[PDB]
RNA sequence: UAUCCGCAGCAGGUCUCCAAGGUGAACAGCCUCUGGCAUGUUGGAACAAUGUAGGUAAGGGAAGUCGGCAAGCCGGAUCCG
RNA sequence: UGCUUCUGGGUCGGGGUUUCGUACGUAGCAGAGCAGCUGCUGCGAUCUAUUGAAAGUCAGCCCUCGACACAAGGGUUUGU
């Protein structure tokens, strides 16, 4: 007989094989469509989740209830240094799909790079590329490499460069770093190869990715939470006390004359870890980094024209479990994907986006940096001290 | 250069943080052992009947956050033990664990 | 013209409250709330500016064994205010009134929340403090 | 944004944190934590209190 | 809780004598001395799900369920009543 | 994920942060009062000063560039 009450159905089946990523670090299964009318430029970027945060802004969206008021809003910190690019990839798509064509390393390739091709950095002689390398300064070798060019510029159709993040430039335990494609999007393919050649072997910071006051899209892979039982995978209603033989199940787990069990009745497994995106997430700043000139350490990232305070994005006692960011970094709205100093990709939006939440100017009134190891009261050390005055052990 | 005397000071408190009640004294003793033997390159660690009352006077569940222990390298007596060399780890009674460095305690 | 956001709301069916008026009621007994489509095995449940179905469990005679609509005044769950404060109130209260928000009485005893005061504006007349 | 003090420990309150406690004769009180407000429930002096200011400026501390 | 009966070194059963200190109305419960013992037919490493035995939970307060089942509230003494 | 660019991690120590709430001792003509000796000496819960003190703080917190030792090792396989 028929279910007498309907209700809809515990979670979603667009997420099925809800096992363990095979990747650390998210892959971007599909890139922003091309067209030659715009500039050549990237379309995604790596960093690394750092933690969360306070923002003070003044809305302004007409017809609201919170219009010209003034809003508190958690935002994510993604700590980014700038990559440096070591390789092209050309590919051609074929009626089978898409296939790579050719690849082209550079001449000089750091060991930070070097460590992600071993999986064991201290007992390897350290080989790689060594004798590619000699490809780079021989007459015969570089006119090889300029008919490699051209042939991926008379037979390709999309362009991907190769690149990968400074791990020297970060408070994380590893030094291996993260290689990655990231396709060019702009102009014809004569013109995204000679780009993509002329600053081969060179850095490529985040403001020339991603621009202020855009909204895009993460990509990564969620906290790992073990074996977990239905009542928390799947968020189905616990049974009632008088249960005999445990009440944290799925009492029905199929009819009986469809002899098996499907695939959509909750069962208990792995929860977490999985490759997820998010879409439209909004950045509300792009902070420079520490830097240094005159002999003075300029750090007032988190210093807003109403403040002007020199205070750092670094709260009190740094960001927990995970250190200090001394680089440059980018401040989205709400909460991303991962856990502290996980990895982490962006990349430009797929959709067109004409819409006013889209289209909001954001200006920072107040970031706040309060100690996040417990109950913080003191923006910064020196407004502490003058609070409290001086201690026994001054 | 084998036989030699150092002296440290152990953070318990640490080294045992998020075990049951039952078990933090025992525990205690293995990993005074295993830092011992870590410290010491040698698998032989034997441990004084007075370091062994000072890591249980407070109880089984209260255990010292920190200790201070001598240990000493010294060659095995017992010529036909595999071992060649074994470390005795003894108790240091002290009042505060202010600004003690590892000191390296000579003969 | 613009909308009430989303509160915590914490007054399931069921819920005794007290009446902060002079119509004569002292409590008010919550047994349903207008606006909920609802889900399985879920207690409709109202916060503070939402409009309920009630009865007086102690009171006057003539106004008791029956239903009447009134306005949630306080409520006791701490609710997020979109400037970043977290209010709550000592007790929970409301008030009787019609089907279209004029109040039954004519005074009212304690403060008003703001968003209850801004949603009906016959409330917040004769409301004496706010928020 | 304004930066408004602890109604019991005289502390200063940022716009993130805390909470806001209206009782029902008015007189709208705000708190730092859930310590202070603890505290205020309980119908403790801060006067007597060691950590707030309160007891800090009576005493001349 | 191993010399008896129960197929067994079986959480069952099997008639009596003696009886310290403190708290406390008390041979109640809890801590100790005289006397006894080695955790009850094994140990080691971790701390997933589901269990068994305990706890705590914002706002509401029986809306749960056949049914307040289960847990929770109350608790001693003195003075009123 | 890490395992010699005098570099590295590891331990300990030191700072930052943070939790609780002001330690022991000493001094007090502070202290309901009581005992003794002719104002002093004793008993006395508590209070005041030293004292936002003392204690804890990654084991899955943040920086150290202080001290100490250690790290160029071991084993099993893989051929176009
Ligand atoms: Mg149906
Ligand atoms: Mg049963
Ligand atoms: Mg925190
Ligand atoms: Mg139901
Ligand atoms: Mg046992
Ligand atoms: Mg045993
Ligand atoms: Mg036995
Ligand atoms: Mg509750
Ligand atoms: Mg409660
Ligand atoms: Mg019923
Ligand atoms: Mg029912
Ligand atoms: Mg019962």
Redo the contacts with the bound molecule.
């Keep these: 007989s028929h279910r007498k009450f309907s209700a809809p159905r515990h979670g979603s089946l667009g997420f099925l094989p809800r096992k363990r990523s095979s990747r ?1 670090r998210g892959k971007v299964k599909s890139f922003p469509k091309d067209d030659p009318s715009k500039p050549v430029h990237l379309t995604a970027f790596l960093g690394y989740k750092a933690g969360m945060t306070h923002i003070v802004r003044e809305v302004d969206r007409p017809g609201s209830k919170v219009n010209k008021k003034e809003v508190v809003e958690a935002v994510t910190i993604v700590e980014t240094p700038p990559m440096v690019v070591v390789g092209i990839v050309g590919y051609v798509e074929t009626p089978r799909g898409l296939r790579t064509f050719k690849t082209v390393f550079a001449e000089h390739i750091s060991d930070e790079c070097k ?1 992600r091709f071993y999986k ?4 390897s002689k350290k080989k790689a590329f060594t004798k590619y390398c000699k490809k780079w300064q021989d007459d015969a070798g570089k006119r090889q490499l300029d008919k490699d060019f051209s042939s991926m510029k008379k037979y390709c159709q999309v362009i991907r460069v190769l690149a990968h993040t400074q791990m020297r430039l970060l ?1 994380l ?4 770093a ?1 290689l990655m494609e990231i396709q060019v999007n702009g102009g014809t393919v004569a013109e995204k190869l000679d780009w993509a050649r002329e600053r081969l072997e060179q850095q490529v910071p985040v403001s020339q990715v991603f621009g202020q006051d855009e909204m895009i899209d993460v990509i990564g892979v969620t906290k790992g939470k ?4 239905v ?2 995978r799947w968020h189905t209603k616990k049974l ?3 249960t ?6 799925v009492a029905c787990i199929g009819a009986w004359h469809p002899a098996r069990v499907a695939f959509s009745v909750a069962r ?1 497994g792995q929860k977490g870890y999985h490759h997820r995106t998010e879409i439209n997430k909004k950045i509300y700043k792009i902070g420079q980094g520490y830097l240094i000139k005159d002999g003075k350490l300029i750090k007032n990232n988190a210093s807003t024209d109403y403040d002007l305070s020199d205070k750092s994005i670094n709260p ?9 960011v001394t680089n440059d970094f980018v401040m989205l709205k709400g909460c991303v994907v991962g ?1 502290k100093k996980r990895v982490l990709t962006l990349r430009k939006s797929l959709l067109v986006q004409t819409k006013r939440r889209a289209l909001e100017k954001i200006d920072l009134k107040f970031i706040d940096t ?2 996040k ?6 923006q910064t ?1 020196e407004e ?1 001290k003058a ?7 001054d | 250069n084998e036989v030699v005397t ?1 002296e ?4 318990i ?3 045992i ?2 075990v ?1 009640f039952k078990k933090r004294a025992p ?1 205690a003793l ?1 990993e005074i052992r295993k830092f011992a033997m870590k ?1 010491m ?1 040698t698998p032989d660690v034997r441990i004084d009947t007075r370091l062994n009352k000072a890591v249980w006077a407070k109880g089984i569940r209260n255990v010292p ?2 200790i201070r222990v001598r240990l000493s390298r010294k060659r095995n007596e017992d010529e036909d033990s595999p071992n060649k060399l074994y470390t005795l780890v003894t108790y240091v009674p002290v009042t ?9 305690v000579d003969e | 013209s613009g909308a009430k956001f989303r509160i915590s709301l ?7 409250i007290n009446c902060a008026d002079n119509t004569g009621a002292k409590n008010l007994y919550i047994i349903s709330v207008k606006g909920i489509k609802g889900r399985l095995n879920r ?1 409709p ?1 109202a916060g503070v500016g939402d409009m309920v179905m009630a009865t007086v469990k102690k009171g006057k005679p003539e106004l008791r064994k029956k239903v009447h609509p009134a306005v949630v005044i306080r ?4 609710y997020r205010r979109k400037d970043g404060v977290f209010l709550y109130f000592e007790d ?1 209260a409301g008030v009787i009134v019609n089907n279209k928000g004029e109040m039954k009485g004519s005074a009212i005893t304690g403060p008003v929340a703001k968003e209850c005061a801004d949603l009906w504006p016959r409330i917040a007349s004769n409301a004496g403090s706010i928020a | 944004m304004k930066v408004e003090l602890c109604s019991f420990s005289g502390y200063k309150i940022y716009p993130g944190h805390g909470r806001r406690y209206a009782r029902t004769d008015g007189k709208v009180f705000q708190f730092l934590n859930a ?1 202070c407000e603890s505290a205020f429930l309980s119908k403790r002096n801060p006067r007597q209190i ?2 707030t ?1 309160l007891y ?1 400026r009576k ?1 001349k ?1």
């Design positions: 650390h460590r064991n950095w201290h007992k408070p335990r590893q030094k291996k993260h073990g074996y977990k039982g009542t928390s009632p006390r008088k005999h033989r445990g009440l944290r199940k208990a009190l006692g740094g960001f927990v479990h995970y250190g200090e856990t309060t100690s190891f417990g109950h913080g009261r003191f050390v502490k609070f409290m005055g001086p201690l026994k052990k | 150092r440290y000071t152990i953070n408190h640490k080294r943080h998020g049951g525990r293995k410290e390159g956050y920190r505060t664990f202010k600004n003690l460095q590892t000191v390296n | 914490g007054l399931p069916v069921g819920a005794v207690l449940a409520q006791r769950k701490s929970n | 310590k060691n950590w200011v800090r005493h501390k």
